[PDB]
């Protein structure tokens, strides 16, 4: 269903209040840990020597309750950036005190406001609390989509509201967030409590928050409409945002008094649940992409490494891609054996990297479908997978299939091939070294032979995700370069991100490769027009391949093959995030580089600013030949 | 101790308001410890206060009392931490205090209340940034104004004009309101943006002059007409929480700060008197109707102090 809490700034009895909100179906309570009005003096006598207690006792709840049900709140008088020095000092002292109490209590989260532009000293104090013990507890920064000054009623005769359009200005609240998090050096403990108003801003303003670490959405009772039966409800545009936010799995917080007085506060929560269960449904693929959202993975290197049984099992788990392969071979067979020559003509079909035989089985289904005759070679360098193959061939395929336990670049074949078939492609196409492997094998392909696939193309797109930037940054390891995390690609179901530009083709390969001298090295320059203010954090990679003629496979979103959504895209990080102003072009440069020993990518951004070249001479990342 | 009157007054004394007859209205909050609530007390003998046993009447409020005001002689209008504005009514015998109405219209703590010149209307101000106008008899909100862009600190009704009230906020705005204008609010302030405005008091006789205190302890006298920042004194080492005019023909002005001090100032803003009596925050002042030279201060030190002013 939905994870939801109640926001209160009045708790007479913490016991009854918590009990009440439980009966109303709230998972947790946001409340002050000190009385919001109880302003404290730390430096000046006599109020400094105010007898205590300074707040209510930890003993009033279980450690478990404090740990799970309670989100603390900074008292609203606390103004660390106050221009008034005595207020600044008392607010520094009080903020430390209240944060130290939430740590004392074991609170899972604590709410702090970003309610103006300058929160420098507030960030400096929070950073201090974070750098005082390693603790897990989250800090939810309460920021509004729309600054209060731009929300205010136009009811001041001599202070009219500026009704003029303001692209940058309407985005001021994100800049408040950006500056705070940047000062606190992207602490994983600091996330966004996004506060929504009755008036949503422009879609550009909402888009600003796409890649940001949103843990909580705050819905005032104010923003809720009333149906005929007098139930609380939301505008379709509000409802669209909820459906957007459910995808990011945020916790919803209900703030304000009951305005639908006939009905209980169950009413507001009832509505959210109603939206949850009745949400535009996803797909099996989104169920396939189940728990992998923004989960960073090492790209598989099935050449340099021998894949495990369950790796092959997952490759086999999506039948559709093999049905595509079956179809490409079927078509190629009919184009090569006239119906007159069906029984005289038996084609030599070689599966190059046969794994546990899915392409072998697809090749066989294709031949019986075409009613045409094939001899099969199953070539596989992974001797563990040869075990699976040789049991299959003994038990089922028989002597039609000759299993070969060899690297296709070393193998001396007894005869030349009509058709070579392979699945040597990664999420960035050539990133498993299909080029080098098939190049080594082509000397044993007939002069009129077909490679399936005949072609593949990598695509790139610039993306924004402060979330994934932090994920990568967090992948530092001992005994290597402290920044090697950023100079290697990751396979990942990119989820909390913004794609800043349409994907552009990067590198393309063709098989057979007729070039008299063959260079699989590449240098490509891409220009991505960007129509929004944003921060570049890296580049999403995808691929398309032509198996045969019109039969293709793609993970490129615009051309995505059906059923192949368990096959995730790739991410090329950059070390330093890059600010991009609307109307600017992002220019990225990519190299595919090689030795006898290793193939690697190097990459740089040249616009709107220059990055360092990432992964120079494969220092951080190579692919084994 | 009376019937319906609690054994123990909450420690944090928020409000002190003398009625015409000289009876004392007390508001108190529990701002620490287990239970965070408040209380309303009537002391027909003001010198007994704060002692609960020697009280004419007392009641417990669900939540703390941020602000208070007399509504005529038997009415008490309350700013609650709960976001409710509540109307409490005195008994015929005035031996107990009964809730007339409690309306939860504010989304956050109700910080400030004032009764307008009619006595049938009040203005509320809240940390929720809204200012509301109340039909006291029908117990509803006539108007709700989001003029400000931060928490509303003070709202003070005009002495004699039922459409006019001041407001101040941490948006650094002093707003002059007139509900007769389709754009009711008007920003009033000295040439330089200065320290946040904290406290407000209309001149009792001069319907177009008011005074405001700031978070830096400066007290300022303002003429709507001249719209010039006429006079300012550095009266306090900290925030000016409250400003109260004497009942005198030429009024004296009581100044109360978080510096835990009270000062009394002439119309020229010069300082006649100073009391260090309180050892915590000074929350309110009411001059005795009976003896105009007598002034009662209340503080979070739970002290009810009676001052004789020279
Ligand atoms: C089915 S995933 C790709 C398969 O091709 C195999 N493979 C990759 N490169 C080569 C090569 N050069 N020679 C033989 N098999 C290969 C891998 O072991 C893997 O099972």
Question: CB atoms < 10 A from the CB of B84, how many?
Answer: 22
Question: CB atoms < 10 A from the CB of A310, how many?
Answer: 8
Ligand 1, atom 5, lies closest to the CA of A353
Cα gap A338→A247, rounded to integer Å: 53
Instruction: Using the structure block, give the residue that is written with the tokens 């067979």.
Output: A333
Cα gap A96→A546, rounded to integer Å: 61
Cα A267–Cα A272–Cα A278 angle in degrees, nearest 5: 120
Q: Do B142 and B134 touch, CB atoms closer than 8 A?
A: yes
Instruction: Tokens for A257, please give them.
Output: 């008094």
Q: Do B274 and B265 touch, CB atoms closer than 8 A?
A: no
Report how far apart, in Å, the C-alpha atoms of B221 and of each of A100, A211, B233, B256, B273 are: 42, 51, 9, 16, 19
Q: Do A565 and A574 touch, CB atoms closer than 8 A?
A: no
Cα gap A38→A101, rounded to integer Å: 15
Question: Hey, are the CB atoms on A11 and B187 less than 8 Å from each other?
Answer: no
Secondary structure (3-state) at A381: coil
Q: Do B210 and B241 touch, CB atoms closer than 8 A?
A: no
Cα gap B23→B97, rounded to integer Å: 14
Cα gap A187→A237, rounded to integer Å: 32
Q: CA dihedral in degrees (B255, B299, A17, A257; nearest 10)?
A: -20
Q: Do B108 and B80 touch, CB atoms closer than 8 A?
A: no
Chain B nearest-CA residue for A37: B31
From the CA atom positions of chain B, what is the Rg in Å?
18
Question: CB atoms < 10 A from the CB of A549, how many?
Answer: 12
Q: Do B106 and B86 touch, CB atoms closer than 8 A?
A: no
Q: Choosing from A92, A170, A171, A423, which is the catalytic residue? A: A423
Cα gap A405→A391, rounded to integer Å: 13
Instruction: Tokens for A410, please give them.
Output: 């070393």
Q: Do A107 and A137 touch, CB atoms closer than 8 A?
A: yes
Technique used: X-ray
Domains of chain B by residue range? 1-310
Cα gap B231→B242, rounded to integer Å: 18
Q: Do A351 and A360 touch, CB atoms closer than 8 A?
A: yes
Selection from B172, B178, B200, B175 nearest residue B186 by Cα: B175
Instruction: Tokens for A82, please give them.
Output: 């106050």
Q: CA dihedral in degrees (A90, A96, A99, A100; nearest 10)?
A: -130
Ligand 1 centre and the CA of A370: distance in Å?
27
Strands A445-452 and A417-421, bridge-based pairing: parallel
Cα gap A433→A422, rounded to integer Å: 12
Q: Give every CB contact of residue A112 below 8 A, 6+ residues apart in sequence.
A: A74, A122, A126, A139, A140, A141, A142
Cα gap A578→A538, rounded to integer Å: 9
Q: Give the burial string for A415-439 (b: 16+ CB within 10 Å, else e).
A: eebbbbbbbbbbbbbbbbbbbbbbb
Q: Give the DSSP H or E segment for A359.
A: helix A358-370
Selection from A452, A457, A454, A447 nearest residue A362 by Cα: A452
Q: Do B214 and B240 touch, CB atoms closer than 8 A?
A: yes
Secondary structure (3-state) at A319: coil
Selection from A104, A577, A213, A8 nearest residue B62 by Cα: A8
Q: Give the burial string for A323-351 (b: 16+ CB within 10 Å, else e).
A: ebbbbbbbbbbbebbeeeeeeeebbbbbb
Strands B84-90 and B75-80, bridge-based pairing: antiparallel
Cα A49–Cα A54–Cα A56 angle in degrees, nearest 5: 160
Q: Give every CB contact of residue B235 below 8 A, 6+ residues apart in sequence.
A: B213, B217, B218, B219, B255, B257, B263, B265, B269, B271
Instruction: Using the structure block, give the residue that is written with the tokens 């960030």.
Output: A123
Q: Three-state SS across chain B? A: CCCCCCCCCCCEEEEEEECCCCCEEEEEECCCCCCCCEEEEEECCCCCCCCCCCCCEEEEECCCEEEEEEECCCEEEEEECCCEEEEEEECCCCCCEEEEEEEECCCCCEEEEEECCCCCEEEEEECCCCEEEEECCCCEEEEEECCCCCCEEEEEECCCCCCEEEEEECCCCEEEEECCCCCCEEECCCCCCCCCEEEEEECCCCCCEEEEEECCCEEEEEECCCCCEEEEEECCCCCEEEEEECCCCCCCEEEEECCCCEEEECCCCCEEEEECCCCCCEEEEEECCCCCCEEEEEECCCCEEEEECC
Beta strands in A275-359 (DSSP E): 346-352
Q: Give every CB contact of residue B65 below 8 A, 6+ residues apart in sequence.
A: B14, B15, B27, B28, B29, B38, B39, B40, B78, B79, B80
Cα gap A169→A117, rounded to integer Å: 12
Q: Do B293 and B264 touch, CB atoms closer than 8 A?
A: no
Task: Indicate which atom in ligand 1 lies nearest the CA of residue A380.
Answer: 15
Give the mutation candidate from A14, A37, A161, A218 for the B interface (greatest B CB count, under 10 A).
A37
Cα gap B30→B38, rounded to integer Å: 6
Instruction: Tokens for B147, please give them.
Output: 């003029």
Instruction: Using the structure block, give the residue that is written with the tokens 């299959």.
Output: A392
Specify the DSSP class assigned to residue A148.
G
Q: CA dihedral in degrees (A364, A367, A370, A373; nearest 10)?
A: -160
Distance from CA of B18 to the nearest CA of A (A): 24
Q: Do A488 and A203 touch, CB atoms closer than 8 A?
A: no
Cα gap A389→A203, rounded to integer Å: 54
- Is A322 annotated as a binding-site member? yes
Q: Give every CB contact of residue A109 below 8 A, 6+ residues apart in sequence.
A: A71, A72, A137, A138, A139, A140, A215
Ligand 1 centre and the CA of A353: distance in Å?
4
Tell me if chain B has a CB within 8 Å of the CB of A541. no
Cis peptide before B118 (omega within 30 of 0): no
Tell me if chain A has a CB within 8 Å of the CB of B165. no
Phi-psi region of A316 (alpha: psi -120 to 50; beta: other; left: phi over 0): alpha
Q: Three-state SS across A436-466? A: HHHHHHHHHEEEEEEEECCEEEEEEEEEECH
CA B208, chain centre distance (Å): 20
Tell me if chain B has a CB within 8 Å of the CB of A5. no
Report how far apart, in Å, the C-alpha atoms of B181 and of each of B124, B144, B163, B177, B227 are: 19, 15, 9, 8, 19
Q: Do A383 and A405 touch, CB atoms closer than 8 A?
A: yes
Question: Treating both helix axes as pointing N-terminal to C-terminal, what angle do A358-370 and A320-336 enclose, rounded to 10 degrees?
Answer: 40
Q: Give the DSSP H or E segment for A367.
A: helix A358-370
Secondary structure (3-state) at A46: coil
Q: Which residues of A touch B63 (CB under 8 A)?
A: 10, 12
Selection from A575, A615, A574, A573 nearest residue A598 by Cα: A615
Q: Give the DSSP H or E segment for A404.
A: strand A401-404
Ligand 1, atom 4, lies closest to the CA of A353
Q: Choosing from A98, A212, A432, A471, which is the catalytic residue? A: A432
Q: Give the DSSP H or E segment for A64.
A: helix A63-68
Ligand 1 centre and the CA of A316: distance in Å?
15
- Is A312 annotated as a binding-site member? yes
Secondary structure (3-state) at A535: strand
Instruction: Tokens for B128, please give them.
Output: 């929720």
Tell me if chain A has a CB within 8 Å of the CB of B17. no
Instruction: Tokens for A519, please give them.
Output: 């260079």
Q: Give the DSSP H or E segment for A219.
A: strand A214-220
* Ramachandran angles phi, psi of A28, nearest 5°: -160, 170
Question: Hey, are the CB atoms on A10 and B183 less than 8 Å from each other?
Answer: no
Instruction: Using the structure block, give the residue that is written with the tokens 């009394």.
Output: B264
Question: Hey, are the CB atoms on A12 and B259 less than 8 Å from each other?
Answer: no
Selection from A597, A595, A602, A606 nearest residue A619 by Cα: A602
Question: Hey, are the CB atoms on B37 and A12 less than 8 Å from each other?
Answer: yes
Question: Hey, are the CB atoms on B80 and A35 less than 8 Å from each other?
Answer: no
Specify the DSSP class assigned to residue A137.
-
Instruction: Using the structure block, give the residue that is written with the tokens 């509320």.
Output: B124
Selection from B61, B178, B149, B71 nearest residue B114 by Cα: B71
Report how far apart, in Å, the C-alpha atoms of B210 and of each of A324, B206, B224 are: 83, 8, 8
Cis peptide before A53 (omega within 30 of 0): yes
Specify the DSSP class assigned to residue A371.
T
A432 is catalytic: yes
Ligand 1 centre and the CA of B196: distance in Å?
72
Secondary structure (3-state) at A375: strand
Q: Do A433 and A623 touch, CB atoms closer than 8 A?
A: yes
C-alpha count within 13 angstroms, C-beta hemisphere, residue B125? 28
Cα gap B189→B234, rounded to integer Å: 18
Secondary structure (3-state) at A322: helix
Cα gap B95→B22, rounded to integer Å: 16
What are the counts of helices (DSSP H) followed by strands (DSSP E) for chain A?
15, 26
Cα A581–Cα A586–Cα A591 angle in degrees, nearest 5: 160
How many beta-carbon contacts under 8 Å exist across A and B? 132
Cα gap B230→B222, rounded to integer Å: 6
Chain A nearest-CA residue for B301: A50
Selection from A464, A468, A520, A522 nearest residue A493 by Cα: A468
Entry resolution (Å): 2.1
Q: Do A271 and A233 touch, CB atoms closer than 8 A?
A: yes
Report how far apart, in Å, the C-alpha atoms of A405 and of each of A390, A421, A516, B170, B259 are: 10, 16, 30, 78, 88
Among the partner-chain residues A54, A157, A220, the one whose CB lies closest to the CB of B181 is A157
Instruction: Using the structure block, give the residue that is written with the tokens 């009895």.
Output: A13
Task: Identify the bridge partners of residue B24 per DSSP, sorted by sequence position.
Answer: B18, B43
């Amino acid at each position: 269903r939905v994870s939801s809490g109640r926001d209160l700034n009045c708790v007479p009895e913490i016991a009854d209040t918590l009990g009440a909100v439980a009966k109303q179906g709230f998972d947790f309570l946001c409340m002050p840990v000190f009385h919001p009005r109880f302003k404290r003096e730390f430096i000046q006598e006599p109020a400094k020597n105010r007898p205590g207690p300074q707040t209510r006792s930890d003993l009033l709840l279980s450690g478990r309750d404090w740990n799970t049900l309670i989100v603390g709140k900074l008292s609203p008088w606390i103004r660390p950036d106050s221009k008034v020095e005595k207020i600044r000092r008392n607010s520094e002292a009080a903020m430390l005190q209240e944060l130290n109490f939430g740590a004392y209590l074991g609170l899972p989260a604590f709410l702090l406001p970003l309610n103006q532009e300058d929160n420098t000293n507030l960030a400096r104090v929070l950073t201090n609390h974070i750098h005082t013990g390693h603790h897990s507890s989250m800090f939810w920064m309460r920021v509004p989509l729309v600054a209060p000054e731009d929300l205010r009623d136009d009811i001041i005769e001599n202070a009219p509201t500026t009704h003029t359009e303001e692209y940058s200005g309407e985005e001021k609240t994100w800049m408040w967030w950006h500056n705070f998090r940047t000062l606190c050096d992207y602490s994983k403990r600091i996330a966004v409590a996004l506060e929504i108003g009755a008036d949503l801003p422009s879609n550009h303003v909402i888009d600003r928050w796409l890649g940001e670490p949103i843990k909580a959405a705050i819905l005032p009772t104010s923003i809720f409409l009333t149906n005929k039966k007098g139930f609380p409800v939301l505008s379709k545009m509000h409802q669209r945002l909820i459906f957007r936010l459910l995808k990011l799995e945020v916790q919803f917080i209900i703030t304000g008094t009951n305005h639908h007085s006939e009905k209980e506060f169950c009413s507001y929560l009832q509505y959210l649940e109603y939206l949850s269960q009745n949400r535009p449904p996803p797909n099996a693929y989104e169920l396939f992409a189940k728990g992998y959202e923004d989960y960073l993975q090492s790209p598989l290197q099935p050449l340099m490494d021998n894949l495990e049984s369950q790796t092959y099992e997952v490759f086999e788990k999506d039948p559709i891609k093999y049905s595509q392969y079956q179809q490409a071979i079927y078509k190629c067979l009919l184009d090569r054996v006239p119906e007159e020559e069906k029984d005289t003509n038996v084609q030599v079909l070689m599966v190059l990297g046969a794994g546990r035989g899915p392409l072998v089985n697809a090749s066989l289904r294709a031949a019986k479908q075409a009613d045409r005759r094939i001899k099969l070679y199953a070539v596989e360098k992974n001797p563990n997978a040869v075990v699976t193959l040789e049991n299959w061939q003994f038990e089922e395929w028989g002597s039609q299939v000759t299993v070969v336990s060899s690297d296709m670049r070393e193998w001396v074949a007894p005869e030349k091939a009509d058709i070579i078939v392979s699945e040597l492609l990664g999420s960035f196409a050539d990133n498993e070294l299909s080029p080098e492997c098939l190049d080594g094998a082509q000397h044993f392909l007939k002069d009129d032979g077909v490679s399936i696939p005949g072609e593949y193309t990598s695509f790139l797109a610039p993306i924004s995700s402060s979330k994934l930037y932090n994920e990568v940054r967090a992948c530092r390891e001992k005994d290597r370069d402290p920044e090697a995390q950023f100079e290697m690609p990751y396979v990942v179901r990119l989820h909390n991100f913004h794609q800043l530009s349409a994907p552009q083709p990067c590198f393309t390969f063709s098989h057979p490769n007729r070039d008299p001298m063959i260079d699989n090295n590449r240098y490509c320059t891409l220009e991505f027009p960007v129509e929004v203010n944003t921060v570049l954090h890296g580049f999403a990679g995808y691929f398309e391949t032509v198996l045969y003629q019109d039969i293709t496979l793609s993970i490129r979103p615009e051309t995505h093959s059906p059923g192949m959504f368990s096959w995730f895209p790739i991410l090329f990080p950059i070390k330093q995030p890059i600010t991009v102003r609307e109307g600017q072009t992002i220019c990225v440069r990519f190299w595919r580089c090689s030795n006898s020993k290793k193939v690697w990518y190097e990459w740089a951004v040249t616009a709107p600013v220059c990055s360092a070249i990432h992964n120079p001479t494969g220092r951080s990342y190579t692919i084994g030949l | 101790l009376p019937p319906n009157a609690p054994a123990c007054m909450e420690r944090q004394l928020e409000a002190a308001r003398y009625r015409s007859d000289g009876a004392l209205l007390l508001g108190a909050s529990s701002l620490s410890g287990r239970c965070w609530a408040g209380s309303l007390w009537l002391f027909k003998d003001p010198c007994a206060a704060p002692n609960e046993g020697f009280c004419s009447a007392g009641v417990q409020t669900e939540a703390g009392v941020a602000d208070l005001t007399w509504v005529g002689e038997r009415g008490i209008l309350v700013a609650s931490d709960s976001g409710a504005v509540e109307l409490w009514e005195l008994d015929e015998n005035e031996t107990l205090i009964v809730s007339k109405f409690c309306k939860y219209e504010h989304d956050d703590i109700v910080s400030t209340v004032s009764v307008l010149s009619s006595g049938t209307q009040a203005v509320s101000g809240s940390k929720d940034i809204c200012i509301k106008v109340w039909d006291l008899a029908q117990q509803v909100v006539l108007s709700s104004y989001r003029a400000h862009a931060a928490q509303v600190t003070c709202v003070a009704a005009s002495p004699h004009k039922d459409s006019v009230f001041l407001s101040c906020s941490e948006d650094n705005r002093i707003l002059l309101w007139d509900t007769r204008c389709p754009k009711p609010a008007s920003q009033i302030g000295c040439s330089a943006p200065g320290y946040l405005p904290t406290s407000l008091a209309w001149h009792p006789q001069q319907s177009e002059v008011f005074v405001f205190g700031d978070e830096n302890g400066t007290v300022s006298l303002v003429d709507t007409k001249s719209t010039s920042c006429v006079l300012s004194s550095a009266v306090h080492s900290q925030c000016v929480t409250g400003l109260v005019f004497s009942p005198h023909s030429v009024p004296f002005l009581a100044s109360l700060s978080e510096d835990c001090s009270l000062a009394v100032l002439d119309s020229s803003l010069s300082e006649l008197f100073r009391s260090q009596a309180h050892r915590d925050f000074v929350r309110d002042a009411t001059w005795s109707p009976l003896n105009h030279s007598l002034l009662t201060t209340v503080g979070w030190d739970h002290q009810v102090v009676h001052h004789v002013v020279p």
